[PDB]
Every structure is written in structure tokens, then in C-alpha cells.
Specification:
Four copies of one chain form a homotetramer. By secondary structure, the first copy, chain A, is mainly α. Chain A has one domain. The first copy, chain A, has nine helices and no strands. In chain A, helix 1 packs antiparallel against helix 2 and helix 5 runs antiparallel to helix 8. The two termini of chain A are 39 Å apart. The complex binds zinc ion (4 copies). The site of one zinc ion has 4 residues of chain D, from loops. The PDB classes it as transcription. The entry lists the keywords transcription repression, transcriptional corepressor topless, alpha-helical structure, tetramer, transcription. It forms a tetrameric assembly. The entry is titled "Crystal structure of the rice Topless related protein 2 (TPR2) N-terminal topless domain (1-209) L111A, L130A, L179A and I195A mutant".
Chain lengths: 199, 199, 199, 199
């Protein structure tokens, strides 16, 4: 992709936001990977929308890309696990443990064991290391603080956290400039689909 | 929204497709509601991606908007129900029946009863009216044929089924026209974010 | 089985009751089929122990033995079904409907349909015929009244509802009589396993 | 209970067996606790009827009565757990782990952890200590061999493993002796419920 084409994506991101095509905005952010929307990410973490959180992240990094990315996915999936335990859904917890968390076992065998053993407690706060889990809301906020620091320090997000400053409706402005150009060819002085003409 | 702004969405739809931002394309189709992609819809129906099918439809119509829309959602949810029965998941079938299909009971009480009673059969092909359900693949294709006819006849889709014919990369062309205009102001004759200048 | 052997079972039923071998009592009642314990049956119905209720009944009658027996099992399984609905366990309800209640469909097609359709209600008291279901406790008591009348009128229970009047510990008394007989052979005048002897 | 009354139970156990009241036999064995039927226990272990196995055992010992009893229940519940894993029912396995196996954690913390961690394997034979689990049939037979040795060495089963040798139908014989005694009072020389008389 050209630098031109990349900039055009940013102009479109701005346009879509101004037109309040909100889901389209975040899909384009994700598929192009040119811009990671922190506020959007924070929103989804607070709402516990873990599926969308990972889907969004997937446009920017894989779990094993580097150590920051690994800890990011580990923290998210671990919170997902603990929340399952908290609602007494041990069936879901084990599912999460095997499908989402097992990839981390290689990197730290004994931590995975420690986390596995939480399954068998009446309340996993009986483990002193997990006695710090307060409620869902507070534990998400605490974790989010850590997630932000990991993302901001993650080299794969290096130039993707600040939106280019531009004047409002920059795309619309360029379009109007093209219309003026189309007219600056016409003697004797419609649509965007085909050029404007005069006799 | 202006006719200008609407046309700009179409230019963006073309650009996104050319850049192979496929999910963004269909999200913009859905959120703007300006264009319904039949081929995309066919693909998702054949794949049995019922959640995405309804989500996509939701940008164009509600279940109770008119009779065509009602039959469209009824046919989709009924196929979803029958497929649940076919894999012997009666728990899921009842869920579908109560959550997705019950809204249709008012409009036809006895058909809903008929469909409900399929739950109790060893094989719902024991009902002669449903003896026509062959396998999943063939039943999806048959239904799709009907879905297309309902959509094409649905007044809410009237001008949304044919993409405007335009030359490739129309957005990119307008952008280049703006660049030429920015230069047609410069004595003595960079970026898209701010205007190009010469001394 | 002889009339002797049958009477011996009754003597054993009395002994087991006196020794408070309560589960053994009801197992012997069931396996021999000589006596149906109404009070025990009432207890299990009030407690909603449907599995044991049917197991106990199974020693005395099959579901299709006659019309009384059929209505007895129908009423029990229908209550089991309604209770599942009441606790919002539609998965269990459908299971009951297909496994336990379907055998009754042949005998009354439209009643089974009526009962099936209760699945789809938010509250099955929306059906006027089932608007009479109050709470679990009261509905069990009402049904029990009907179950008793069906059992008492059921020809297969004809001579099995009243325990033979006998003096307490009749078995123990006969045993002591045998011991006296064993001694009424001994010059010159231990265990039950072998005869008592004197030199 | 007298030694008389205890012997009478054995006479009844014999009678019930001779009359093929099989479930009553094992219920009386269990409730009286006077005799533990090894062959019956073997049968139920081979059939994997774990609920009935524990119910039967419950008449003779509690899990924490002594070390033999503890190992007996541990081995049974562990096999139940492994079988759940084998059929890929991790939901059931966790249930067993928390409800049935947790009581053993106090006595051996690290073995319980080891067993817990089997949940997360694709195949729990990946653990070298559990690489010995062959198939269900063979693992039940192996375990049964150990269960027998534990039961035979368990002081609570000391005099409960061998049935008293007696002649067939000993109860029936004593009954006939009582009938003869009832007649050895009659000038001038029916039922078991009341004494036999002549004018
Ligand atoms: Zn012009
Ligand atoms: Zn210039
Ligand atoms: Zn004597
Ligand atoms: Zn006599």
C-alpha cells in the first residue's frame, strides 16, 4: 500500500466518524491496522466484550508476536476466566482455560497450574494471590490500566495511537476541490460518478 | 444525508472493495443501508451464518416492516430451527422457537403450532408437510431462491440491488483532480492532510 | 409362588418394618408386588420423587396394562413436565415430553399437542386449561387425590391396599415356636442356623 | 440388636435370594450392614454403576472412617473422574473433582493438584503417571483387584465377607417346625398369620 492510499484511509476514517458510521469506523481501523482506537478499546474492556476485544486486537497483533502482545492476551483471557468462576459457571471456565489460556502454559508452566487450581475452590479468593480480585467492575478498571501501558509500550502499536491532526471534513474538502477542477476545464462556464460538463 | 454524501459512500464502497477491506465493505453497506450485496447475502446463507445474515438484513429492514420482510425473517429462522432439529439439538431448537419464531405466531397461530410439534418427532420428516426437507445444503439452496424473490420484490430494497456503474478507482481519480487543483494555484509552479504549496 | 410363601413375605415385611429397615421394606413391597404402600406413595409424590414413584409403581403395573394405569402414569409425568416449565428449564421439559409423555400421544393426539404448545408460553398459565396450576405444593396435593382414586379403582391393586391384620412380631413368634419344638425332642431336657440339642 | 435378630436377618437374606428378590437382598445387606456381598460389588464396579456402588458401601463405612475406607472411595471417584475425561465431558469431570474428590485434598494436597491438571490435557495419558490408563474395561478390572484387597484388609468388614454356611431354606424349615408345634397342642389331632387349631 502507498503512503497516499494509507492517508486516504485516514480521510475515510474521519468521514465515517463524522457520518456516525461507528461500526464501520472500527472495522476499517481493524482491517487496515493503521490506527488503534484506545477509547474504543477501553469501552469494550469495561463492557467485558471479550470477543470483540480480541477481534479488534487481531488486526494489529497476534498473541505470539512479542512479549507485550502475549501479556495483553493473557491478561484479557485470565479476566474472562475469573469472571466465569465468579458467576459459578465452572463449565465455561474450563472451556476458557483449555481453549484460550493453554497457549500460555509453555511460557509459564506453574502459573497455568496455579490458575487451573482455582477451579476447585468454593471462592477463588481463598488463594492469597487471587485474594485481590474485588468485583468485576474494579478488576476490569485495574487491568485496563495495565493493558494501556502494555499497548503504549508495544512496538507494533508505535505509530498507531495518535490520530493525525486534520481539519474537519478533509475528504469532503478534497472532493469539492475536484469539482472546481472539473469546472476549470469548461467553456462556456450533477454527480460524483462522472465528470461535470458544460457546452 | 445529501445526495452528494450518499454518492461519496458509494465511492468509498468501491475503494474499500478494491483495497480488499472486505468486512469493512459489508459493514458500510449495512450501516448506511444504501446498497444490499446479494452475492454476499447468498454466501452467508449457504454457509448458514444466520447471526450475520440477520445483522446484515437489520440495516435494511425490520422484521415487521412489511409482509415481504416478515416472510424473509420467518424463512431464515425456520431453517435455523429445522437444522437444530436435524443435529438432534432439541434444546437449541426450543430456544430458537421461543426467541426467534414466536413473533410470527400472531400472524399465523396454526403454522406456529405445526412447527412447534416437530420437536416431538424422532425425525421431523414424519410430518408430510416437512417430508420435503432433504439435507442442509439442498434446503438452503431452495430457500435462498425464495429469499431472493422476496428481497427483489420487497419495496424497501427497490433501488438498493444494483451497484452504480462507474469507472474503477473513481475516488482515487477525484483525489488526483484535487491535487491538480491545489497545484493550479501555485506560482512558481507531500500529503493529503494539508494543501500542497510552492514558493 | 405358594400361598404359604406369599404369607411369609408379609411376615418379613412386618419384621423389616419393626426393625426399621425402611428401604428394604419398600423394595420387598415392589419386587414381590404383594402389597402397595399408599402412605409411602403419598410421601414420595409430595416430595416430587418422580423416579422412585415410577420405580415403585413398576412392581405393580405397566403403563399400558389398563386405562387406570395409563392415566396414573400420564398424570405423574404431566406434573413432572409442568414443574420443569415452572423452573424455566425448557430443555428438561422437552426431554420429559419426548421420552415420558409421547407414549400417550396415540391415545389422545390433540391433548399431547396442547401440552407440547405449553413450551412456548412465557407462563403456561396463559393457557386457560392450565390456568389452574397454582404452585407446586398445591398441584401435587390435588393430583395425589386423583392418583389415590385411580389406584383404589385399579383392578390390579384390588387386594394389595390393606395390610393383613396380625399381632406384632408374628415372625419372631413363629421362630420361638420352632425353638420350643427343637427342645421338645431332647432328652435329657445357641443358634438359628442349626437345630438345638441336649445330651 | 440381639444375636437372635441378627441371625434372623441372615435367614431372610437366604430366603430372599432363593425367591430371587435380588434388589431386596442387596438393600437388606446394605441397611443391616451384616453382610457385604463381594460378587455383587464386583458386578457393579465392572458395570461402572458408581452411584449404586457408593450407596451400597454407605451401609458399611463412611469415607473418613479409616485409611482403607478413604482409599476405597478415592479410587472409585478417581476412576469416575478419568472416565468422564475419556468421553470428553470436561463439565462432568470438574463436577466430580469438586464434589466427590475435594474431600481428599486435605490428606494429599499435591495429588489432588496433579489430578486437577488432567483437565487441561488433550489426552490425560500425556501425564506419565496416568499414561497407564488403558481403556475403561481394563482400568476397572485393575482397580477392582485393589478394591478387593482394601476391603478384605479393612477392619470394618472383618466378619462380613463370608456368608454363614447353612442348609437351603433354613427359614422355611423353622416355619414348618412352628406348624408342627402348633399341632402338638391340639386334641383331637390354614395360615401363618394366626395359630392352627383343631376341635
Ligand atoms: Zn463548467
Ligand atoms: Zn505548485
Ligand atoms: Zn433340650
Ligand atoms: Zn391339630
Amino acid at each position: 500500500m502507498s503512503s497516499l492510499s494509507r492517508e486516504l484511509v485516514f480521510l475515510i476514517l474521519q468521514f465515517l466518524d463524522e457520518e456516525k458510521f461507528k461500526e464501520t469506523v472500527h472495522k476499517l481501523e481493524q482491517e487496515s491496522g493503521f490506527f488503534f482506537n484506545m477509547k474504543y478499546f477501553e469501552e469494550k474492556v469495561h463492557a467485558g466484550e471479550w470477543d470483540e476485544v480480541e477481534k479488534y486486537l487481531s488486526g494489529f497483533t497476534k498473541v505470539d508476536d512479542n512479549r507485550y502482545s502475549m501479556k495483553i492476551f493473557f491478561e484479557i483471557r485470565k479476566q474472562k476466566y475469573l469472571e466465569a468462576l465468579d458467576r459459578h459457571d465452572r463449565a465455561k471456565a474450563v472451556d476458557i482455560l483449555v481453549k484460550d489460556l493453554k497457549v500460555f502454559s509453555t511460557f509459564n508452566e506453574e502459573a497455568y497450574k496455579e490458575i487451573t487450581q482455582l477451579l476447585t475452590l468454593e471462592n477463588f479468593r481463598e488463594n492469597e494471590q487471587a485474594s485481590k480480585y474485588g468485583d468485576t467492575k474494579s478488576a476490569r478498571s485495574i487491568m485496563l490500566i495495565e493493558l494501556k501501558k502494555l499497548i503504549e509500550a508495544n512496538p507494533l502499536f508505535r505509530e498507531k495511537l495518535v490520530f493525525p491532526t486534520l481539519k474537519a471534513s478533509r475528504l469532503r474538502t478534497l472532493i469539492n476541490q475536484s469539482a472546481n477542477w472539473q469546472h476549470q476545464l469548461c467553456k462556456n462556464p450533477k454527480t460524483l460518478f462522472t465528470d461535470h460538463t458544460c457546452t
